[PDB]
Design a protein around this ligand. Structure first.
Ligand SMILES: CCOC(=O)c1c(-c2ccccc2)oc2ccc(O)c(CN(C)C)c12
Length: 273
């Protein structure tokens, strides 16, 4: 473990196969990509990029220099499930804009909501009204939500504001931090401003988001056939894998992703020779 870069399989000292760069999921680390690694060719290196702060573009501003430090002009293979897919895609845009050679972008069910999630004050009220209802059922009666305070804050400020009010009661630090970061990682998916990308993108597409994901944001109950990426990616390939979003990263479904991805890496390795 080195900063935000986790070594899943080290590359040899010099030479060897093109590394696969994986990006962490919402609320998790790149350890989730080990089953994928087992389904990729022998001696395929893999490095995982862990959580950093900011907007998607601000996070890619931190990732891209590190990617270039590790791999130079390319070839770049960028892969991500959940939020990691959006992160991989933003890095692809950043690397291509600097003239780097991006050969593969693999989105593992990084599927946009079927209806756009507005970034408006009305949506802040709707969002927190929903969460308040969850806190009433699962725990109490909740007073009027101070909407005027919330709508001036960003997502990090909103959740800190609510945690501060909840204290004034007692929640363990480890649980608060895990929920906070998982919540913030998911909101980062919602608020991502997707830019056009002119390279080939491979979208492994499950059947649907899992139930808990839909409970937090019901617009995820519907997906478009292109997963919301077609309008930004003209060179888009979709690989149906079935199942639920939460299963896409695990055996047995990852075998389908890995079999397809292994073929793509093989062609990349051939084209280097
Ligand atoms: C268990 C799945 O939960 C999540 O999907 C979300 C959490 C969450 C909160 C606390 C713990 C874990 C996840 O917070 C969110 C906020 C907005 C939102 O759209 C989503 C849905 N995502 C698929 C994007 C979530």
């Amino acid at each position: 473990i080195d900063g935000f870069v986790r070594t899943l399989r080290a590359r040899p000292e010099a030479g060897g196969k093109v590394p696969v760069f994986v990006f962490h999921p919402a609320g998790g680390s790149t350890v989730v990509y080990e089953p994928l690694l087992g389904r990729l060719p022998a001696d395929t290196p893999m490095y995982g990029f862990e959580r950093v702060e900011g907007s998607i573009e601000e996070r890619a501003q931190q990732y891209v220099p590190k990617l270039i430090e590790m791999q130079g002009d390319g070839p770049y293979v960028l892969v991500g499930w959940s939020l990691g897919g959006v992160l991989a895609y933003a890095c692809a845009i950043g690397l291509r804009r600097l003239g780097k050679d991006v050969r593969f972008v693999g989105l593992i069910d990084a599927v946009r909501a079927g209806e756009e999630i507005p970034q408006t004050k009305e949506e802040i009220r709707k969002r927190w009204d929903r969460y308040a209802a969850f806190a009433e059922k699962t725990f109490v009666t909740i007073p009027a939500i101070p909407y005027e305070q919330l709508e001036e804050l960003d997502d990090e400020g909103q959740v800190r504001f609510v945690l501060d009010a909840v204290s004034q009661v007692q929640i363990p630090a480890g649980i608060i931090e895990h929920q906070r970061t998982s919540y913030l990682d998911n909101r980062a998916i919602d608020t991502a401003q997707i830019q056009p990308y002119d390279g080939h993108v491979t979208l492994y597409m499950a059947d649907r988001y899992h139930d808990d994901a839909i409970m937090f944001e019901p617009r995820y109950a519907v997906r478009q056939p292109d997963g919301g990426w077609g309008e930004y990616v003209s060179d888009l390939e979709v690989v149906p894998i079935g199942g639920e979003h939460i299963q896409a990263i695990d055996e047995p479904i990852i075998a389908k992703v890995g079999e397809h991805m292994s073929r793509a890496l093989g062609q990349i390795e051939a084209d280097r020779t």
